[PDB]
């Protein structure tokens, strides 16, 4: 009997806390390790470390058939220990149900460790507000089922379907809001029925790492000493975080630099809406994925100091090196930001303004649309 551990990821807040489960376990140098993680490549200089370590793509939001070669290696009664993304998680298992059911007499699911993707799940779930949530989880149960029995997907409840897996697997449920379960008042039949099953993500967990782990965990996430010392200029701090577009259009990706340059010249100039002063050092924060879309940012802007986009925000509170004041576009990294620190949070009844209001985020003032804005 062997355990084989999978962590499973195509975005940045799941891979996050995964690389801290693996920092953890890390002194286990032949542990049967399967990582697809499509936004973190882990050093050679660690690979080299470790036996029984495996590599898989991500396509569609599932680990592509070379899983299959991969766990072929291991001929014996495996039992799997999956870390997977909450908002794609009926997909990222698809491709391991379809192997179990190939052998069955030798894997099993061991358990499920589940993270948010971000704010996609809480969105989501904002949307739900007027179902009868008791009855739409007594209806995923039944259809995971279905998935369960004969690898096909059928979700009448898609959002739903995410939190039902306590009905045929071990399970643990890591949110970026735990607040939210509790405010939520229509949620609260989902709150009871996952039970003891969930915490919040533990932003806390690195400050409990020995210094060697901490060492180890930095190198994972791309964070080193250069950026560090960025952030340890002694001036009054301003970051500007970035977002994207999962728009290929043109037109659409040329909008979104445009407006985000505008929205920056909002928060560092004298004439802006949401100006901050003129004793603040301005760093750009851009997101993982924002491509040219980051690039327009340091092509046009001036005096301002990069953070290497692929650096999760979270690994500067970890760190200890948050700034003063940060302003951009609504992304994730604002749900775990404290408030004090908050400038301006400028969105693109809308879901995601419902979703932050809930969690006071941001107050009862007039949201600010980015398309609000003067072209300065
Ligand atoms: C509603 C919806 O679709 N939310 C998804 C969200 O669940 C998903 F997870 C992600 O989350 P997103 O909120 O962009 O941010 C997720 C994480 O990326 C890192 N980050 C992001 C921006 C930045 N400037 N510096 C950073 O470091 C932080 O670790 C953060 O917590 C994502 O693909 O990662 O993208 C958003 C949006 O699709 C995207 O914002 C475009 O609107």
């Given at each position: 009997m062997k355990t084989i551990t999978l962590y499973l990821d195509p975005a940045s807040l799941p891979a996050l806390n995964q690389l801290m489960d693996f920092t953890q376990n890390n002194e286990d140098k032949t542990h049967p390790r399967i990582f697809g993680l499509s936004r973190f490549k882990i050093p050679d200089n660690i690979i080299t470390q470790y036996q029984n370590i495996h590599f898989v793509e991500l396509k569609d939001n599932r680990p592509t058939e070379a899983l299959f070669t991969i766990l072929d290696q291991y001929p014996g009664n495996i039992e799997l220990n999956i870390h997977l993304n909450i908002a794609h998680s009926v997909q990222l298992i698809?491709?391991?149900?379809?192997?179990r059911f190939?052998?069955?007499d030798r894997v099993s699911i061991q358990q499920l460790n589940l993270y948010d993707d971000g704010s996609m799940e809480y969105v989501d779930l904002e949307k739900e507000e007027n179902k009868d949530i008791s009855a739409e989880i007594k209806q995923a149960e039944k259809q995971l089922s279905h998935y369960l029995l004969t690898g096909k997907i059928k979700f009448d409840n898609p959002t739903?379907?995410?939190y039902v897996w306590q009905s045929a697997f071990p399970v643990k449920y890591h949110f970026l809001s735990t607040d939210y379960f509790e405010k939520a008042e229509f949620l609260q039949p989902l709150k009871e029925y996952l039970a003891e099953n969930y915490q919040k993500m533990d932003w806390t967990a690195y400050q409990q790492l020995t210094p060697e782990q901490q060492a180890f965990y930095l190198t994972l996430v791309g964070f080193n000493d250069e950026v560090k010392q960025s952030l340890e200029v002694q001036q009054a701090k301003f970051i500007f975080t970035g977002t994207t577009t999962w728009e290929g259009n043109t037109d659409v990706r040329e909008y979104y630099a445009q407006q985000q340059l505008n929205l920056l010249n909002?928060?560092?100039?004298?004439?802006?809406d949401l100006f901050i002063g003129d004793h603040y050092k301005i760093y750009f924060k851009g997101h993982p994925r924002g491509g040219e879309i980051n690039d327009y940012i340091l092509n046009n802007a001036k005096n301002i100091t990069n953070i290497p986009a692929n650096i999760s925000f979270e690994v500067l509170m970890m760190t200890g090196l948050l700034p003063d004041k940060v302003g951009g576009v609504a992304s994730?990294?604002?749900f775990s930001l404290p408030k004090e620190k908050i400038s301006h949070i400028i969105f693109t009844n809308n879901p995601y303004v419902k979703v932050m209001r809930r969690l006071g985020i941001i107050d009862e003032s007039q949201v600010?649309?980015?398309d609000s804005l003067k072209q300065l």
């Open positions: 698809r491709p391991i149900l379809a192997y190939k052998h069955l739903i379907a995410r909002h928060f560092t100039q004298a004439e802006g994730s990294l604002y600010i649309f980015w």
